[PDB]
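User: Assemble these into one structure.

Assistant: Restating your components, then the assembled model:
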Amino acid sequence: GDAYAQWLADGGPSSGRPPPSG
Amino acid sequence: GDAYAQWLADGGPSSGRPPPSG
Amino acid sequence: GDAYAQWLADGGPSSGRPPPSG
Amino acid sequence: GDAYAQWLADGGPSSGRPPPSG
Amino acid sequence: GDAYAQWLADGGPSSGRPPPSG
Amino acid sequence: GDAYAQWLADGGPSSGRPPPSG
């Protein structure tokens, strides 16, 4: 869940990284 | 994760749709 | 604000409608 | 804005509370 | 998912609470 | 409105950025 928050912050899909499970 | 991102973008619970798991 | 919630629900920018003030 | 995000999360127009300014 | 949206709105990782499952 | 939409998409207050007005 915290990894997922960071992934959103970084642009979500457009971050180019997989959505994390945490 | 991807689907959830879009749901959030659309206002989450305000969207009128249940949260997806992806 | 409620118009803006609906605009999110409808896809936000991709709705093709202006973001409302309410 | 911050309040408005929480108001969305709480159900937005359907929540029984008005949209916030912040 | 719904809880998670509110947790984001409340500050996410910085909020002092853990990410929700719902 | 547009800028705010993106901020929301990025986790709102969880993004670490203040809410924009547009």
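Chain B touches chain C through six residues (CB under 8 Å).
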